[PDB]
Design a binder for these strands. Structure first.
Ligand SMILES: [Zn+2]
Lengths: 97, 750, 10, 97
RNA sequence: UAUACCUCUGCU
RNA sequence: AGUAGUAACAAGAGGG
């Protein structure tokens, strides 16, 4: 959720995460999850950046500019990933940055 | 443009922007799996540094024990443990000359402690290796367990209640040749149920007698494990836990070392941060005042490499005996116990290892005991090699570790050694063209060398460096450096013509502590406060630190403000309290209330700050002394939390006892183990202490002393309480007989 | 530039 | 004179020679060689794309999945999904499904 | 041997 | 697969 400089409040959706099983005992134990994230970035322009991802093409979007509408394809960066209780704990506290 | 934060250092000196070099907003490194690989590395490295020493097999344990001290002087700069006894004594003597009466009053203070210290004192403290269970246990349980097994054998001197008698029992217990111990094991019964038959797990206990070796090995054992959450290091390292036999003796040695360090200007221990910086400011002030305008001054930002691995129990025995010269021989021999046990110490090798089969897709656990027996086809080369060397040192599951020391064993006596080298640099002792002073805490030191010319400094460095080598101290040449006096570093304090701020060191302490709603609020506001004072936390950032802590506190405890549109498990009940309340500003944050805090009130506890604004009935409920949420603890452990900056210190906070002073649920994994019964023992012990405190209310403030029975003391109190409650009071005559009859009935049941 | 690839106007 | 004696006996190879430090003399740190480093964050950074709705809700209010469906319902022009960049080590049709 | 379930545990 | 990094997680134990 964010507030524009114009004052408008807004709710944003970047994608989805699918949590696996999570019988986390030790603080290093892993939850597997899948992250499905929108993007306009073409992965082929920098394929070494996306070793772990499987990038899909899922739609097309009409985008405003100054005085012209552009047609861009919509990608979905998909990957399996993991985290732990200790890493989640420290992510929850990232405001101290 | 590519952004590069490092380029700030072009304009801002490194000390004044040092915060940008501490990445302490991310999770620190943690170990996964065993620390057996690290314990073997430590054991192996320790013997390598002492390898030119003299091997000998122990009469009582059969362990191969390397002795490097008074060995061949080193001939390279590699880490060496060839400390020379006579050089240590000369340094300790120089410490006695420079501080007349220090050793005397230090010993006398320790004498008085030994005579007054009760066995209780070992209930306090960090975890301890328990030989009853071959596992770490809370200090108090390991104490109760050892006393129980001592009682079931022929040792009961501690019955007196004084700690020196428990220590006698420990030494008398090494003469036993059949030490009996109870274990626990799972039994599988079968029982009928209304109408099939189901299996039943239960727990039985079985007696086991131990060899004379067995008990001795166990009593000289020090646990090992990996140190987690450690900053500034690529690779993990191993840490150790003392056992119950050595603990009490370590307590009194460290107490002597503490009393010495308390009175040495060059010791960083045991004082706190601000006093460390004052002590460092003094030797700079002192070194400059004692030098001529012609002379120079350089400062070594100093680190000693392999600090614990290259100190020695035998050398510690020399120190103790010299520091105690002229004292009663019982007091000298009592303190000498811990160094001796440390010389014949043995290290547990940890969990072991886990193996894996890709074709078969299976995993298996293997104990460290099995590292003697076992085939080496399973292991990789480095681990295989490590097992090849550790086998020569293996003794009944453990590895013998006569030389060296391990992190977590011993605290302050090694600093007394380092200080004695600093004390050698007085002008009146060296009488050269150079001289030095400084401060030291464990492996970290700052050394100020003054001299007439730059070459004099070199002479002093070598003289300091080589004298340190002669007592097993190895200055790191990789991580120490030198420069003209004016800037230096010391335990992450940064001096630049005066100490500057290192705020990022404290970043992990900004957050919700996790004690409870009451303690956390007091802890959080106080963290902000003390950093404004001690680490240049500016007023604007401190205000925002309040805002962020309240945000974190509200989410963590699902206690958002009573007028929020959020939805949690608690919003509805908090909403009820909100609408029912007249003075909302009096509601605690944990009850849906507003944040009262700004810069000016960080030092006022929340309840105190909102007292005037509370609805009377809310306040009466909040602080109701009959509420079922609080744990009525002892006075000495009231308003205490535990925090980790040191080893692990206790943090005291200021808070009113309320319904928010609650305790989270206990861990329950033990219910699936053979130790299950310990919970019932604790349940029984607690009711016994609960009823005693009804007859002795002051036992929650001052531990009661006495050799009599818990029941007899209660009975004695019951008889006389009933007496005055009637004789000169307000209880009837028939009731006096109603009580004393019950005391007679109880006395009959023995 | 021309548009926002993170906050596209659609 | 115990310390002085042994100090005379010890080899003079045991020393700490001061080598003066000039940052004009010293070299740059060696960075390793290998395959290129991949992205490893838990979520996309600069490559993220948002579907959003205008919403007076505050910085954590509303049912997440209800909010999510509301954001999805702002975008049409979805497509039949196709793989445009495989996860070489993965069964990519699982990601698609 | 395979498939359902059922119970305890999430720092011990 | 993935997390991860000097050894682990990718549930453990039981109803055998
Ligand atoms: Zn909030």
């Amino acid at each position: 959720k964010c507030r524009d400089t114009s004052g408008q409040r807004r709710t944003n959706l970047y994608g989805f995460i699918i949590k696996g099983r999570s019988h986390l005992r030790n603080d290093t134990d892993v939850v597997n999850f899948i992250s499905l994230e929108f993007s306009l970035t073409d992965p082929r322009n920098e394929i070494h950046k996306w070793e772990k991802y499987c990038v899909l093409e899922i739609g097309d979007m009409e985008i405003r500019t100054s005085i012209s509408t552009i047609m861009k394809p919509v990608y979905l960066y998909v990957r399996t990933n993991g985290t732990s209780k200790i890493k989640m704990k420290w992510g929850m506290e990232m405001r101290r940055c | 443009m590519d952004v590069n934060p490092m380029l700030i250092f072009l304009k801002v000196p490194v000390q004044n922007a040092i915060s940008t070099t501490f990445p302490y907003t991310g999770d620190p490194p943690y170990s996964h799996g065993t620390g057996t690989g690290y314990t073997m590395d430590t054991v192996i490295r320790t013997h390598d540094y002492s390898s030119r020493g003299i091997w000998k097999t122990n009469s009582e344990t059969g362990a191969q024990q390397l002795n490097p001290i008074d060995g061949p002087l080193p001939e390279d700069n590699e880490p060496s443990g060839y400390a020379q006894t006579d050089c240590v004594l000369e340094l300790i003597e120089g410490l006695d000359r420079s501080h007349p009466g220090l050793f005397e009053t230090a010993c006398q203070e320790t004498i008085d402690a030994i005579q007054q210290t009760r066995v209780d004192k070992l209930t306090q403290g960090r975890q301890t290796y328990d030989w009853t269970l071959n596992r770490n246990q809370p200090a108090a349980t390991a104490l109760a367990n050892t006393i129980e097994v001592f009682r079931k054998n022929g040792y009961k001197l501690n019955e007196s209640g004084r700690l020196i008698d428990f220590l006698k029992d420990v030494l008398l217990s090494f003469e036993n040749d059949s030490m009996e111990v109870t274990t626990h094991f799972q039994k599988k019964k079968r029982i009928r149920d209304n109408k099939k038959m189901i299996t039943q797990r239960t727990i039985g206990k079985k007696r086991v007698k131990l060899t004379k070796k067995n008990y001795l090995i166990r009593a000289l054992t020090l646990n090992t494990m990996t140190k987690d959450a450690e900053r500034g290091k690529l690779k993990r390292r191993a840490i150790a836990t003392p056992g119950m036999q050595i603990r009490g003796f370590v307590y009194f040695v460290e107490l002597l070392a503490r009393n010495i360090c308390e009175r040495l200007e060059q010791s960083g221990l045991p004082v706190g941060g601000n006093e460390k910086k004052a002590k460092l400011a003094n030797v700079i002030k002192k070194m400059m005042a004692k030098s001529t305008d012609e002379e120079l001054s350089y400062t070594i930002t100093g680190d000693n490499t392999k600090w614990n691995e290259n100190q020695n129990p035998r050398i510690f025995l020399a120190m103790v005996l010299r520091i105690t010269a002229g004292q009663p021989e019982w007091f000298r021999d009592l303190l000498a116990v811990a160094p001796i046990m440390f010389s014949n110490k043995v290290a547990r090798l940890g969990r072991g290892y886990m193996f894996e089969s890709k074709s078969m897709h299976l995993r298996t656990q293997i104990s460290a005991e099995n590292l003697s027996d076992i085939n080496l086809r399973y292991f990789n080369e480095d681990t295989k090699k490590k097992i090849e060397k550790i086998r020569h040192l293996m003794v009944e599951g453990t590895a013998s570790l006569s030389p060296g020391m391990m992190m977590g064993m011993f605290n302050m006596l090694s600093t007394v050694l380092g200080v004695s080298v600093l004390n050698l640099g007085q002008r009146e002792i060296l009488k050269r063209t150079y001289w030095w002073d400084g401060l030291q805490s464990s492996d970290d030191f700052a050394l100020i060398i003054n001299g007439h010319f730059k070459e004099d400094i070199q002479q002093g460095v070598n003289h300091f460096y080589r004298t340190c080598k002669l007592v097993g101290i190895n200055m790191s040449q990789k991580k120490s450096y030198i420069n003209k006096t004016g800037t230096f570093e010391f335990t992450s304090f940064f001096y630049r013509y005066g100490f500057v701020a290192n705020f990022s060191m404290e970043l992990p302490s900004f957050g919700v502590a996790g004690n409870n709603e009451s303690a956390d609020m007091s802890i959080g506001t106080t963290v902000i406060k003390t950093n404004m004072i001690n680490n240049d936390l500016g007023p604007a950032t401190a205000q925002m630190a309040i805002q962020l802590f309240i945000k974190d506190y509200r989410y963590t405890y699902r206690c958002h403000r009573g007028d929020t549109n959020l939805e949690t498990r608690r919003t509805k009940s908090i909403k009820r309290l909100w609408t029912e309340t007249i003075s909302k500003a009096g509601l605690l944050v944990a009850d849906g209330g507003p944040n009262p805090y700004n810069l000016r009130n960080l030092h006022i506890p929340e309840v105190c700050l909102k007292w005037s604004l509370m609805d009377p009935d809310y306040r009466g409920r909040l602080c109701n002394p009959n509420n079922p949420f609080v744990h009525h603890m002892e006075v000495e452990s009231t308003n205490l939390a535990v925090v980790m900056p040191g080893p692990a210190k206790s943090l005291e906070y200021d808070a009113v006892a309320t319904t928010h002073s609650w305790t989270p649920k206990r861990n329950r994994s033990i219910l699936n183990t053979n130790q299950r019964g310990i919970l019932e023992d604790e349940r029984i012990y607690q009711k016994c202490c609960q009823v005693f405190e009804k007859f002795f209310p002051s036992s929650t403030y001052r531990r009661p002393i006495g050799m009599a029975s818990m029941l007899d003391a209660m009975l004695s109190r019951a008889r006389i309480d009933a007496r005055i409650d009637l004789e000169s009071g307000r209880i009837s005559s028939q009731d006096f007989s109603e009580i004393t009859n019950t005391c007679k009935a109880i006395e009959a049941l023995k | 530039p021309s548009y926002s690839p993170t906050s596209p106007s659609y | 004179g115990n310390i002085e004696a042994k100090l005379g006996a010890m080899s003079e190879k045991v020393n700490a020679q001061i080598e003066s430090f000039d940052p004009r003399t010293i070299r740059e740190l060696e960075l390793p060689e290998g395959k290129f480093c991949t992205q490893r964050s838990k979520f996309l950074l600069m490559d993220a794309m948002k579907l959003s709705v205008l919403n007076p809700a505050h910085e954590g209010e509303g049912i997440p999945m209800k909010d999510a469906k509301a954001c999805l319902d702002t975008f049409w022009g979805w497509k039949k999904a196709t793989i445009i960049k495989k996860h070489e080590k993965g069964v990519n049709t699982n990601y698609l499904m």
